């Protein structure tokens, strides 16, 4: 409701892919998540679905945001707000609206918001090599992701004023909780190819086969019937959050560059600490004294981004993202100059 002018302007056209997330960051003084969250959640009528107070929502968003470390160059609440923005953009797509149920939407927007809560700016392999308490707690398995999901629920249901799930019927909540957990866990990168390949084999290939029969009468019905099964909506949701999570390369050039600087600095920090403690260095390439950020981005894009967005774009139709990805890939290439 009552929001300072500058912040109101910063939340300009959050519906467009081109969005100045850094101006929101500055305007909100490192509190972009509560502002974009409230607006996004309202535009999607989430409390009206969970039966919560716009006041209980604020308390929730506030506690989740506070548990994102501002000190992290990359994994701070701004990254979360950015992922939330990409998620809403995807949910707003015809293909997605025509495939997911409102409860999947709720799961996605919430998953995006909490997916990295309390991230320490270190990778899972680092926590394991160090014997960090979280690594011991989670038996060196999907350490951070399990933690984001768990801590999130502990903060939410641990206080009546934060519990945006308080007024839900056990069954509905139970299903929403499982969906949220599934999406957060799906962000662990070691499972990257498993998730993308399943999406390609169960969504893109079968759909191309049906779309060969043209776009006639019952044809479409057969298509919509197949895409809406619980199994497929799950694979679609996993793909959606994964793509929102690493969508930086598909953003306007200025933003793309900033995101690359932030994540790189976070990785360099870790490398300096690993060698300092004599711990095994996991990202030998990510050393601030040896690593070329543009070349690293190129490799990153070729390895994870290209094929994954290829598949996502074929299913949802995202020319804007693909054009940005091409332009940015060319920029990093153009910076060679040598
Ligand atoms: C290898 C990948 C899982 C981690 N990773 C990376 O290496 N670079 C360079 C990124 O920009 C990036 N953004 C998210 N994850 C990233
Ligand atoms: Mg994560
Ligand atoms: Zn993330």
Q: Is 192 in the pocket of ligand 1 (CB under 6 A)?
A: no
What count of other Cβ atoms lies within 10 Å of the Cβ of residue 82?
26
Report the domain count for the chain.
1
Tell me the CA distances in angstroms from 147 to 22, 39, 114, 118, one per residue in order.
Answer: 27, 27, 10, 8
Euclidean distance between CA atoms 320 and 317, whole angstroms: 9
> What is the distance in A from the centroid of ligand 2 to the CA of 243?
12
Q: Given phi > 0 = left and psi -120 to 50 = alpha, else beta, which region is 171?
A: alpha
Ligand 1 atom nearest the C-alpha of 260 is: 11
> What is the distance in A from the centroid of ligand 1 to the CA of 36?
24
- The structure was resolved experimentally with X-ray
Residue numbering of the annotated binding site for a divalent metal cation = 79, 115-116, 245
Q: Is 271 in the pocket of ligand 1 (CB under 6 A)?
A: no
Euclidean distance between CA atoms 322 and 243, whole angstroms: 12
| Residue the block writes with tokens 């506070």 | 66
Starting from the CA of residue 188, give the closest ligand: 2
Question: Which residues are designated catalytic?
Answer: 75
Euclidean distance between CA atoms 296 and 6, whole angstroms: 36
Euclidean distance between CA atoms 304 and 94, whole angstroms: 25
CB 37 within 8 Å of CB 61 = yes
**Full 3-state SS string of the chain:** CCCCHHHHHHCCCCCCCCCCHHHHHHHCCCCHHHHHHHHHHHHCCCHHHHCCCHHHHHHHHHHHHHCCCCCCCCCCHHHHHHHHHHHHHHHCCHHHHCCCCHHHHHHHHHHHHHCCCCCCCCCHHHHHHHCCHHHHHCCCCCHHHHHHHHHHHHHHHCCCCCCCCCCCCHHHHHHHHHHHHHHHHCCCHHHHHHHHHHHHHHHHHHHHHHHHHCCCHHHHHHHHHHHCCHHHHHHHHHHHHHHHHCCHHHCCHHHHHHHHHHHHHHHHHHHHHHHHCCCCCCCCCCCCCCCCHHHHHHHHHHHHHHHHHHHHHHHHCCHHHHHHHHHHHHHHHHCCCC
> What is the CATH number for 219?
1.10.1300.10
> What is the distance in A from the centroid of ligand 1 to the CA of 246?
8
CB 286 within 8 Å of CB 270 = yes
Q: What is the resolution of this structure in A?
A: 2.1
Q: Is 150 in the pocket of ligand 1 (CB under 6 A)?
A: no
For atom 11 of ligand 1, the residue with the nearest CA is 260
Euclidean distance between CA atoms 1 and 127, whole angstroms: 42
Q: What is the length of the chain? A: 338
CB 127 within 8 Å of CB 134 = yes
Question: Among residues 34, 36, 4, which one has the least CA distance to residue 20?
Answer: 36
Question: Among residues 98, 106, 96, which one has the least CA distance to residue 239?
Answer: 96
> What is the distance in A from the centroid of ligand 1 to the CA of 300?
6
Half-sphere exposure of 159 (CA within 13 A, CB side): 14
Tokens read off for 252: 């306007």
Give the structural domain span for 210.
Answer: 1-338
Q: Is 300 in the pocket of ligand 1 (CB under 6 A)?
A: yes
For atom 3 of ligand 1, the residue with the nearest CA is 189
Euclidean distance between CA atoms 115 and 79, whole angstroms: 10
Euclidean distance between CA atoms 320 and 252, whole angstroms: 9
The preferred substitution site among 79, 196, 246 for testing ligand 1, maximizing ligand atoms within 8 Å of CB, is 246
Euclidean distance between CA atoms 319 and 315, whole angstroms: 12
CB 241 within 8 Å of CB 186 = yes
> What is the distance in A from the centroid of ligand 1 to the CA of 301?
9
Q: Is 263 in the pocket of ligand 1 (CB under 6 A)?
A: yes
Q: Is 294 in the pocket of ligand 1 (CB under 6 A)?
A: no
């Amino acid at each position: 409701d009552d929001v300072p002018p500058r912040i109101a302007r910063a939340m300009e056209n959050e519906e467009y892919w081109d969005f100045d997330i850094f101006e929101l960051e500055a305007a909100t003084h490192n509190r972009p998540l509560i502002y974009l969250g409230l607006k996004m959640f309202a535009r999607f009528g989430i409390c009206e679905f969970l039966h919560c107070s716009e006041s209980t929502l604020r308390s929730w968003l506030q506690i989740i945001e506070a548990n994102y470390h501002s000190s992290n160059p990359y994994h701070n609440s701004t990254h979360s707000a950015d992922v939330l923005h990409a998620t809403a953009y995807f949910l707003s797509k015809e293909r997605i609206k025509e495939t997911l149920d409102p409860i999947d939407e709720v799961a996605a927007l919430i998953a995006a918001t909490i997916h990295d809560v309390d991230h320490p700016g270190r990778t899972n392999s680092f926590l394991c090599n160090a014997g960090s308490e979280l690594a011991i707690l989670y038996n060196d398995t999907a350490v951070l992701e399990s933690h984001h999901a768990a801590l999130a629920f502990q903060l939410t249901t641990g206080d009546d004023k934060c519990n945006i799930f308080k007024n839900m019927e056990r069954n509905d909540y139970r299903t929403l909780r499982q969906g949220i957990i599934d999406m957060v866990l799906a962000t662990e990168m070691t499972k990257h190819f498993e998730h993308v390949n399943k999406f390609v084999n169960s969504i893109n290939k079968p759909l191309a086969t049906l779309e060969e029969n043209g776009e006639t009468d019952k044809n479409q019905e057969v298509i919509n019937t197949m895409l809406r099964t619980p199994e497929n909506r799950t694979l679609i949701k996993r793909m959606l959050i994964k793509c929102a999570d690493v969508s930086n390369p598909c953003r306007p050039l200025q933003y793309c560059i900033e995101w690359a600087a932030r994540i790189s600095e976070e990785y360099f920090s870790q490398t300096d600490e690993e060698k300092q403690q004599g711990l095994p260095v996991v990202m030998p390439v990510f050393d601030r004294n040896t690593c070329s950020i543009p070349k690293s981005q190129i490799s990153f894009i070729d390895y994870f981004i290209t094929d994954m967005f290829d598949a996502w774009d074929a299913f949802v139709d995202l020319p804007d993202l693909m054009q940005h990805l091409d332009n940015n890939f060319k920029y990093w290439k153009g910076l060679d100059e040598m």
